[PDB]
Symmetry: D3
Subunit: 119 residues, 6 copies
């Protein structure tokens, strides 16, 4: 077993464009990098306040073969994505959320890469 973490992915529009605000369980804006020690899951819940019909389509990595995150799971409605760590690979990785929208056929990327860390 391990730890199940939950983060909410709030998306609003400012000047026509997406803004991503991450909140934890206690409705605090999330500060800094995710440090993982146990194996486990990080579940991201989409709160789309854009009116652009956003859905998760996956989570993107520049270094996808680094083994830090072992798998990604996604719900059929695109409202949840999970990062899965099965084997506790040490190191650091960075990722961006990838979303579809209903206004156009471009995919949407979260701008600031999220960092996950295992000491």
């Amino acid at each position: 077993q391990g730890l199940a973490q939950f983060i909410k992915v709030n998306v609003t529009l400012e000047n026509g464009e997406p803004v991503f605000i991450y909140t934890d369980a206690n409705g605090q804006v999330c500060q800094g990098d995710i440090t993982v020690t146990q194996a486990g899951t990080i579940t991201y819940l989409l709160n789309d306040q854009t009116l652009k019909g956003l859905k998760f389509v996956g989570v993107g990595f520049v270094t996808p073969f680094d083994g830090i995150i072992d798998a990604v799971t996604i719900s059929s409605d695109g409202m949840l994505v999970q990062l899965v760590d099965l084997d506790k690979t040490p190191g650091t990785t960075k990722f961006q959320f990838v979303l579809s929208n209903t206004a156009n056929t471009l995919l949407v990327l979260s701008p600031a890469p999220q960092i996950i860390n295992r000491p």
Copy 2:
């Protein structure tokens, strides 16, 4: 946050037909019902030893609106499915795994419904 549980779903064939054997972290065959207390995730990992190209396609419920499990997530390769409990609804639910195979176009169901419990 909550608890991340991991169960392996071993599938073999006996007399031409699937047999599902569930194992926990310590490689023990799983005994009894899953009792949940915290919110969290249960991750199921497919170990297909059938040669029939099995993939998870989802998790089926006879009472899908009971709120016990709030969501299901699935990996793109059909090797992982997760049950997600966000809001800790009390009660009991039963489910079966639903899989595709490459030998024919029938879906595969796990026979013995798995039971999840919150006191």
Copy 3:
């Protein structure tokens, strides 16, 4: 050639949960097992009265390699599924309908397995 049978799959909600009522051509509630003699097709038509956006996603079997039903076909809108018997394999099989819904990401299973028989 063979026989084309048609059954309607009425789904309503009772106490928040699905109830499946099968009707034949003459609007009679269906009684007993389907006995097949010729090759052919059984077409199931979804009449979703749940307001939960149900769609067929396939038909599930605990013994999918038994050869009784040889294939399943599905319409693009999930309103029809067909069981196909090409080679008249003798014996008995049991199955459940598997449906998606728009309220949540859990799959829906029909509870009472339908039985198909060839003497």
Copy 4:
């Protein structure tokens, strides 16, 4: 109920390009138009001998709202497609098979439209 008809769709290549040969149950090459009297199903089974990885993706009509065929169902492996007549609409319609292939991203169309007739 009605009649379940089965036709095999043999595809070979001649001078690099697809040739469609239809055969009935008795392995006779199919002659003329399909005349339907009862409601029912026509099941088409793909026998791809092209080495181009052909799969049915649907059945195309120039007059899709004519009501002659009421629905199309397709198997998950693209090896079967069925035309469904639920309500016995009188008249004549024409259609072509639409297939994907693994050599390129163009869809494949059967050349000679198949005609279905109800007097």
Copy 5:
């Protein structure tokens, strides 16, 4: 590099059935065959005025291995399809648009094959 051509695919209904009207940049109805000299792209934009929820699903060819068009690309919303010529294969090919609709599960085919020519 090459030439990017754009054609609009207007679809209306007459007597219940689709009518395809092609217009060029200057809103002229398109006359004759497309003669290509350079490599390049032909982009088709769907203007669906049918109320039948039409979407491109691909472009169909009776002679898909002729090499005249090398690839087809499609937008996620089915509003654009492109024919791609990478290697300037000489000759002539014919094609039809293949569309889904939301009224029924039959695919829709454009009737008059469009001809593309390279001298």
Copy 6:
């Protein structure tokens, strides 16, 4: 009409991880930003030399509603993606390629955002 540009997206692995090398028609490594003046298409062709089964799944933007690129089209095999400019919106946008792979369920992102410019 407009200009059809073609760029090849070569992907290799260095130290286990993807490296993206862009080449133009004349097999030159691509230098600087794409400056567009006419409407048109930019076609990207995937040359995957990673052995990780890469496929395009789309093109991601941090500012997807900026109108610089109006649409994205993708081939069914994920070997081609196209950026489409229909209405010549002035300004600058940045994007990354988003790819699936067959080794794991993480999406792959190209690291250095590509810049497109209209003066």
